[PDB]
Amino acid sequence: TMGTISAVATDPLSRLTPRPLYAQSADGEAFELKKNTCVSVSDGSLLPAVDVMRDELGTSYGLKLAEGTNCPITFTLDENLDVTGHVGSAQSITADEAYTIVSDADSVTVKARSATAGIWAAQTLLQLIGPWTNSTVKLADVAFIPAVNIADAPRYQWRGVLVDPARSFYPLDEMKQMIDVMSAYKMNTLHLHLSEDEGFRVEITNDGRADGDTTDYTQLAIKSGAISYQSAWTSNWSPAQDGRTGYWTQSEFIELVAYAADHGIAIVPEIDGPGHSFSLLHGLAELNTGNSNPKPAAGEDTPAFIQSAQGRSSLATDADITYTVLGHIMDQLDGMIDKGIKASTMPASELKRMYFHLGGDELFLSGGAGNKTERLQEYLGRSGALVKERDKTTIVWNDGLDAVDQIPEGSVVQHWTGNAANNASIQKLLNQRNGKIIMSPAGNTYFPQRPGTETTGVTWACGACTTSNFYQWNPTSSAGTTEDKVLGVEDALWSEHLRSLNDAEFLMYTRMMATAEVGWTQQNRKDYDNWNKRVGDIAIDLMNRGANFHKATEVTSWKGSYAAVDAAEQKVTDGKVLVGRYAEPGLTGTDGLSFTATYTAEGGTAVNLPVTPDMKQTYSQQQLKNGRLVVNGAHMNSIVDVYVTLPSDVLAADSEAVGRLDVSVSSSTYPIPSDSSMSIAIKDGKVTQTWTGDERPT
Ligand SMILES: [Cl-]
Ligand code: NA
Ligand code: NA
Ligand code: NI
Secondary structure (H helix, E strand, O other), X not given: OOOOOOOOOOOHHHHOOXXXXXXXXOOOOXXXXXXOOOEEEOOHHHHHHHHHHXXXXXXXXXXXXXXXXXXXXXXXXXXXXXXXXXXXXXXXXXXXXXXXXXXXXXXXXXXXXXXXXXXXXXXXXXXXHOOOOOOOOOEOOOOEEOOEEEEEOOOOOEEEEEEOOOOOOOOHHHHHHHHHHHHHOOOOEEEXXXXXXXXXXXXXXXXXXXXXXXXXXXXXXXXXXXXXXXXXXXXXXXXXXXXOOOOEOHHHHHHHHHHHHOXXXXXXXXXXXXXXXXXXXXXXXXXXXXXXXXXXXXXXXXXXXXXXXXXXXXXXXXXXXXXXXXXXXXXHHHHHHHHHHHHOOOOHHHHOOOEEEEEOOOOOOOOOOOOHHHHHHHHHHHHXXXXXXXXXXXXXXXXXXXXXXXXXXXXXXXXXXXXXXXOHHXXXXXXXXXXXXXXXXXXXXXXXXXXXXXXXXXXXXXXXXXXXXXXXXXXXXXXXXXXXXXXXEEEEEOOOOOOOHHHHHHHHOOHHHHHHHHHHOOHHHOOHHHHHHHHHHHHHXXXXXXXOOOOOOOOOOOOOEEEEXXXXXXXXXXXXXXXXXXXXXXXXXXOOEEEEEEEEEOOOOOEEOOEEEEOOOOXXXXXXXXXXXXXXXXXXXXXXXXXXXXXXXXXXXXXXXXXXXXXXXXXXXXXXXXXXXXXXXXXXXXXXEEEOOOOOOO
């Protein structure tokens, strides 16, 4: 077979991640999105779903996507929506998140069991439209929703990411960037590890304390916001830079909850104790009492943030003030979560997650009275009772199950270490105490585990925990239980070594998109090789978002993708105008790219135009200096901006000139070239209009 090949968009249904329960092509032509296509909703709680579509498509395709009456696109809330006809004998769904999409050339009909499911339908629709919907510039092509029949719902109700800002703070705007991609893959839970040995990351005020509580809670963020993970206390490849300091103000935290809610994501706070608790002792003089450790130096009210304290924290398990303080922190987080949900337009019934994570990490024992276990059992007994009296379900890590009998009936273990199927404590929780499990086995879900053998990172769980390790497991089987006992899964972003959103995203992506599939897709509809093939498009969307990602060697679908840009919205400078974008992961430069641009005016013959490729940043793998990771060393190349220089002639025509612009790109690093054809109208030295169809839009 001698000749040439030209790149083509993938089949829309073949792209979908997570893979839906049921997804089939329907008869006839695609639905064409127009600037003024409106959307009808049966209920105001579906406007967040439409907002997610507008946030992308307003920029990428110039769509208003305004709310209207009797629109061709409809979102209907149906609390009885039944997708069980697509659930086989070997399958299991949590129906609250169910949606259906039925589309044809004239109409796009979405039914959603919940407001959350509306957002999931929106995310599916944006994957069907394609991987350029997050373009920061308006594209020349029009957007199409293909004719489909989709019925979908998740296997697991709990599909989460733990973020640790306690080791190293993340500003609100970075958290929003994480939320966008989590929502994109139908993750519904953001677990905030708010407190550690090395930091406390949310403002607690003195409003609404219990009668007689004179604790000055303002000092917690003031003192322990100002500490972070210390590079000097490491002897390894950790960056030379300490963790970022800071904390979310109450107003920032409320915004974080609201933004998460508006993207279908509930907040689950963790205030870890009785161990991993130094920030609480450092922050609040009042907690330095009873059997707390380490103690303040003679004359000081708080213990010093020094290397000797590392690994040696315990709250006072024997002191009333410990539970007073936890109760107040719980009430403050609850108040701010309620305010954030109110600010969102999402229902509290869906977005107020009635769970509190106590952690249950083991305390360091120094003083006498009580062994580690007795003190832990007292702590999780009392702190468990705090969560239950607040109408919530207690979560603890594995270490917490030394207190399995003392935490409330119905409590949850977040499993990360060893074999859950063979763990007597876990099986007692699930079988004897009506408990449930959240699966975060380190080897399948811990992002600091290095994603490749060429990378620098944590090695203990897999050597390298690749997309294969993140994809190829069954959480129900790993837990040795039944579907009904498994809430779901969480990835964990621990920040001992993380100093930037860029360096977090390197570890998070694309492994999070494998966890998303494990959370959502039926066991018997999983196919690692198929998921692997779908990463090429996932990556084009991440580059459009400006999100970093590990270019994993085991992924074989990395590709170059070309999009014609609407030059009507682009400035002509010295005859040069942006007409294309070329997204190819891994480019260390543009010298391996060959562009050809041909302009044919009505009345004229083909004229070669000079092409100026512009790539802001090049691709780099991790960088080390003095045996330590450089912050932001690993970063993705930009999308290439493809400029042409229009002839002086055409730009000096005071009469409108219409022409065809053909651009081709060949890459030395991707063997399938792209060919693009766009019509452009030019008047008074400006591009006035572009179109990629056979006929000029009016
Ligand atoms: Cl089946
Ligand atoms: Na998309
Ligand atoms: Na146009
Ligand atoms: Ni780890």
